[PDB]
Design a binder for this molecule. Sequence first.
Ligand SMILES: Cc1cc2nc3c(=O)[nH]c(=O)nc-3n(C[C@H](O)[C@H](O)[C@H](O)COP(=O)(O)OP(=O)(O)OC[C@H]3O[C@@H](n4cnc5c(N)ncnc54)[C@H](O)[C@@H]3O)c2cc1C
Ligand SMILES: Cc1cc2nc3c(=O)[nH]c(=O)nc-3n(C[C@H](O)[C@H](O)[C@H](O)COP(=O)(O)OP(=O)(O)OC[C@H]3O[C@@H](n4cnc5c(N)ncnc54)[C@H](O)[C@@H]3O)c2cc1C
Ligand SMILES: C[C@@H](CCNCCCCN)NC(=O)c1ccccc1
Ligand SMILES: C[C@@H](CCNCCCCN)NC(=O)c1ccccc1
Lengths: 492, 487
Amino acid sequence: PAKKKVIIIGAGIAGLKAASTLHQNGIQDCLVLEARDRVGGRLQTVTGYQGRKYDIGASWHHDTLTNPLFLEEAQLSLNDGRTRFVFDDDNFIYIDEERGRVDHDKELLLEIVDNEMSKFAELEFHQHLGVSDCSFFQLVMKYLLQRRQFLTNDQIRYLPQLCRYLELWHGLDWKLLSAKDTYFGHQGRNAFALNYDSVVQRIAQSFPQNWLKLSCEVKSITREPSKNVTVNCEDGTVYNADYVIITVPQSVLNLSVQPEKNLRGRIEFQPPLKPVIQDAFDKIHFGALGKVIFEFEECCWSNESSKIVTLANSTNEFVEIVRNAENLDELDSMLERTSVTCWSQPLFFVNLSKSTGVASFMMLMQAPLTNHIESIREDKERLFSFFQPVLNKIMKCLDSEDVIDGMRPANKPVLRNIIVSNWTRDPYSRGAYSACFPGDDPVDMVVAMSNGQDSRIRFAGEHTIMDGAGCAYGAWESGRREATRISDLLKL
Amino acid sequence: KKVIIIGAGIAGLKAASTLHQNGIQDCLVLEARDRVGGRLQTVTGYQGRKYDIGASWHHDTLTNPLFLEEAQLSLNDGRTRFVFDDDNFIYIDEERGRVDHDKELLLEIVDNEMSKFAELEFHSDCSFFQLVMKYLLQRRQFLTNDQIRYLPQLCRYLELWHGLDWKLLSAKDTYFGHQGRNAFALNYDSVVQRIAQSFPQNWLKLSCEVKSITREPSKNVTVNCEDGTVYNADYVIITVPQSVLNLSVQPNLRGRIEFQPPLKPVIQDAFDKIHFGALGKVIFEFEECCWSNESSKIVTLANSTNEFVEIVRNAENLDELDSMLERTSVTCWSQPLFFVNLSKSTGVASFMMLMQAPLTNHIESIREDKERLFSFFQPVLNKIMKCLDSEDVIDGMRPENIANANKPVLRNIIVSNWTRDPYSRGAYSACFPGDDPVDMVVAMSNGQDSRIRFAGEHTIMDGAGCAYGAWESGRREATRISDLLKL
Ligand SMILES: Cc1cc2nc3c(=O)[nH]c(=O)nc-3n(C[C@H](O)[C@H](O)[C@H](O)COP(=O)(O)OP(=O)(O)OC[C@H]3O[C@@H](n4cnc5c(N)ncnc54)[C@H](O)[C@@H]3O)c2cc1C
Ligand SMILES: Cc1cc2nc3c(=O)[nH]c(=O)nc-3n(C[C@H](O)[C@H](O)[C@H](O)COP(=O)(O)OP(=O)(O)OC[C@H]3O[C@@H](n4cnc5c(N)ncnc54)[C@H](O)[C@@H]3O)c2cc1C
Ligand SMILES: C[C@@H](CCNCCCCN)NC(=O)c1ccccc1
Ligand SMILES: C[C@@H](CCNCCCCN)NC(=O)c1ccccc1
């Protein structure tokens, strides 16, 4: 029954940073137990056509003005002049299947009214009250209704579709998304990590190799009345430590409050997680941001921008319904009055050619599409067939021609490979990250997690902290937080 | 008299409209000028075109109540009273040309970041210029050379929101959120007229320059225009601009009101923590439109230098940045200028150009020298026309050409005069580094005493410096007085 000072479950960035902090503080005899055959967790870099590398999990350093993880990276690059990231924010190109490009349009002025909708939402909630949540969709309808006298038909038709790019930030359809949580305050530009794995490896490299135990799935954690904690890997292995920092995803941890021990990733807690933790799961959920990588032979399209969003189909009928609806109740009725296509929801494409010089498109998708697409990620023919219409429309707007299917080995773009994410089906992630359905209050979880199960059983991860909640750097900071409190306690 | 309203600006006119709406009678509005409207004035130019030489937009249309009242009237009678003219800004540099929506400069994106940096830094108080310098030094590792060069010139469009150069402007008050889009009033004089005739015309007394306001502990206020006539009223609502009112706390100038007793301390102290901006306007009227109507918003950037970059790249800390930086002649390229292309939004062949201090006072001074004015702005006008797929400007101001129908022909220039009008002495409330506009607001909101009140764009928090702000302040003081008397 090997004795350890600290047992960290999960080798994601939280777990990795927690072990880093522990070592950095002189603490010895710690362990990092990871279920998968790799470290990184939701930070994973995959290889595709010709050795091209892509981050299939997180790709950006957000809030570069305050992001501690980013500043740390930025310093290294200032000292050795090595390119670790690239600021790739750009003027968004918006594409409708019909009206073509609708961005920066002298008549539509979509970005302008979008800015107003944003201020409208802020005014709607920033106004401290028992305001009451609703879906993001309902919030946009309420905006259209209140400002219809000041909007053209075209604005009422396309604005709603254009503002849905926010779905790609939460990984949720606007009808499943909480209005109160939709608008986040970006604190500066984003920086595209040129290998998030290099961030993972650098932190992993900061502590004892022998501390890492890969392919070990923790099944249960027990608190001994005799002040200490017992942990069981699935392969018989048993440990007992003074402290444990649990970093498994909110979705995996959620399995704990359910009866059935035979679930890949689920941990049996003894005593079971306190009611404040269990109940918090009813107040926060999990989104499904997913990715699809489209690799072409050569860059043969306009690199006017690295940011392109394809709007879902809209209809003149909708405008009419908005002009004639006498109120929000009636609007929903009139709206209620087939089958999902690549045009049934907005899709977000990153033109990597401009940003990194690679002839590939990194596309983001949201729930429910992500689940369906990830489910057929092996049927490459079906994937191409599904994304062909939009891939073409984009090439059309970027001065190129229809895409050619070259997946089974001049001016025409030829698709070589297609890589799809698998976060919703992977038992050790079960989705992308924490997100809010309407009525959800993310603070309940953050409080319950950061206050721990008890003095010895702690938590870290993107879902356990306010600043950078959902983000890689937030997960990172939570790792540091828990390790610091513990190294201080061990210091005594 | 029941209540005496000093000033026929929108604050004063609303106060009268309200007092009357509340059955109050026997009231007077004493205006020093020979017209009502104050800093709201629509002038007439070439071919009868009309322009607001004073305020021209309804800001914060999401919450602006004056705007909402105007929108209802239009929903009911269908008359156009305004148009939403926000547009994608076109940014023009003398050497480089258009630098907006640039796939490599992406200036709007760093401008936005700069904006967030400003919010973070103030969550002390320098000049907007200094704030911009800190940001440049602190983020240079993530900025390209051209961004370091052009962004600071682009971000200065904010000088036209305040009517103050970036070295005179308080960084703390530079950025201010907008409650939604702006709407161009198609006749602010319509707003003025509607409110003006919503009370007994015989209440209005034009060309009355109130010279002194006296309060006797014997529950009464005595006001007398400088032409000798004296008035005694229960309540007094003073709406003269902050600039004019600031003459009281000093020793005969035109417009100055002699208060007896003097203005309490809290008020006199407030003039120390709040100042006045000088937003100005120049109207360029062309024969007809012969340029591209891509956008209605065009800003010309002051010139920039690569030596400024090297200084940013080389500066050790913030203190040495200054040194290297503190190392003449004024031209149209010495500051950013904001041009509203009226053709796209109103169908009129004219540009409404906005300017700031220190430049405003200088151009208004030579407002009658058409030749001088055309010569000063010619370069930026040609640069604009070029960028808008047109030709250099032809001076057709002297009525007589025949060789046109191809190039833009300037037919007239109209300049504002707010900095030289003794009754406005500037444009509106504005902050210098170190100011705190809240003191003047509270000082004004509470008043000198129960019978010597204040109204005006400078006496309110929401809509501060705006036409609706002034409007609301007029209703405020009005109501409080309506209640007290209807008692
Ligand atoms: C598609 C996608 C795109 C995203 N894009 C960005 C972005 O651009 N920028 C950004 O900042 N964030 C982004 N995020 C979020 C970011 O990836 C996460 O916030 C971060 O990776 C979370 O790290 P973590 O340590 O909190 O959790 P994890 O990375 O999930 O680490 C938890 C670890 O626990 C392990 N584990 C689970 N169960 C067990 C068990 N029973 N026993 C042992 N080990 C177990 C898991 O294998 C995993 O390795 C994105 C996420 C996704 C999925
Ligand atoms: C060039 C310019 C552009 C602007 N653009 C906008 C804009 O787009 N949108 C917006 O909302 N706001 C704008 N503003 C500001 C707006 O015009 C003011 O906020 C508003 O007009 C203030 O109204 P007021 O009643 O408070 O002051 P005023 O209009 O100055 O009324 C005060 C009155 O008192 C009179 N008076 C002065 N002294 C005496 C005296 N001793 N005796 C009797 N009468 C006296 C003055 O003649 C004047 O009529 C702009 C201002 C300027 C100058
Ligand atoms: C959709 C999101 C995916 C990666 N970041 C997820 C953050 C989730 C925080 N809750 N990224 C973006 O929206 C984006 C948009 C423009 C440039 C760079 C990134
Ligand atoms: C007319 C002036 C705004 C005046 N409104 C009152 C502002 C008070 C700030 N204290 N400027 C603008 O509307 C403007 C708008 C966009 C760019 C530059 C200027």
